[PDB]
Amino acid sequence: TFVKDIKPGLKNLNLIFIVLETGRVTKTKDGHEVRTCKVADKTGSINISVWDDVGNLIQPGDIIRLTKGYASVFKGCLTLYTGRGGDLQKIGEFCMVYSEVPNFSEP
Amino acid sequence: KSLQEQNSHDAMDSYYDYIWDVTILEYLTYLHHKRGETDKRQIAIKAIGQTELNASNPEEVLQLAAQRRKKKFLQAMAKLYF
């Protein structure tokens, strides 16, 4: 189970990721705040789309797994998406070890 | 390699009288000490402690002790198997 293998068109996803970082307020379109957050591990790093509702009450460390997802791209940066059948579900908390060195968001 | 066995069908302690080589009895004493059977170790140490089996005896004395033990052991084997 690696972060690297989040591809478009995948089914029956059971992947595990940890939101160690916090999303930052930013403007998109006019009226909507589609926040974005990035996480990293020993395998790789990937961005996670954060909606306003989740982004207001989010605190770091939560563990969530998606099913029937479909990968998306946002201005050349890969971004996970949920909807039209997809659904999220929290599992646990704090039982992880991270590695922030392999992050691909650097210049 | 044979004394290391433990499924013996012959009276192990009783045959310790018939060993005359001191190294065989040395290995026997080590084996019994390692396995913890103190009493058979005492029998082996008593066997070593016999004056006639002292390895630095005159050669004919050792030869005669070996010969008498050989005779007794072979007679016992004859009584057992005939």
């Binding site: 704090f94 070890v97 991270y98 | -």
Partner: protein, 236 residues
């Protein structure tokens, strides 16, 4: 002790300790006694203790910054948090007793934990309280009933902080050298006895190859090394 009730009780103990309890001979038994882990442990909620156990059992050396900063900003951001730092230091020293097998491994050494705890004391009173908490076990050391875990983080901090953070090492050394006569002159001999026992415990179980370079470190001040030589000719 400012409340007159405690002063009255202390004076009654001084005048006749057997008066309040016939079997209670005096303060000798209390001083020679030991503190059980239950009292140190019980003031912490389970979440903090479990986090510290996870850090000392799973977190490798280097990642300690994120978890401790999270705990500090979330909770340890109050005026009373300074004394709570001392409470956490006491909990780590008295309760947390890791095995030697995990010590041999490359798991996160406790010297980093002690360094983070000490460097966060932003006031002189907080630092004084934390140092008194650290030196509380050092007053009455007993090798037979106590583990070396109460002084291994200390000596590790001194050996590891010589180059990067001389200030912490110098402050701790100055405080532990000056606490000896100041604490209690009628019982300062016990303090020196405990320090000698701890030094002998470090010598017998050689965590470091030689203690000689640290005692007379060139970058330490003159008077500290002078009084270290004066008090303990045995380690010279």
């Amino acid at each position: 002790a400012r409340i007159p009730e405690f002063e009255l009780l202390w004076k009654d103990i001084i005048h006749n300790p057997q008066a309040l309890s016939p079997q209670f001979t005096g303060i000798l038994q209390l001083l020679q006694s030991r503190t059980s882990r239950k009292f140190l442990a019980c003031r912490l909620t389970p979440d903090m203790e479990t986090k510290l156990l996870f850090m000392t059992s799973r977190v490798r050396f280097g990642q300690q910054k994120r978890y401790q900063d999270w705990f500090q900003r979330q909770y340890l951001s109050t005026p009373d948090s300074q004394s709570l730092r001392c409470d956490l230091i006491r909990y780590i020293c008295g309760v947390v007793h890791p095995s030697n097998e995990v010590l041999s491994s490359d798991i996160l050494p406790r010297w980093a934990i002690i360094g983070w705890l000490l460097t966060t004391c932003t006031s002189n009173v907080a630092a004084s309280n934390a140092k008194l908490a650290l030196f509380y076990d050092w007053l009455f050391f007993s090798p037979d009933k106590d583990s070396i875990m109460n002084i291994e983080p200390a000596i590790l901090v001194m050996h590891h902080s010589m180059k990067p953070h001389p200030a912490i090492t110098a402050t701790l050394l100055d405080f532990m050298c000056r606490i000896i006569p100041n604490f209690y002159p009628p019982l300062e001999g016990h303090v020196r006895q405990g320090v000698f026992s701890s030094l002998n415990h470090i010598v017998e179980k050689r965590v470091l190859a030689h203690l000689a370079p640290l005692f007379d470190n060139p970058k330490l001040d003159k008077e500290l090394r002078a009084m270290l030589r004066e008090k303990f000719p045995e380690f010279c």
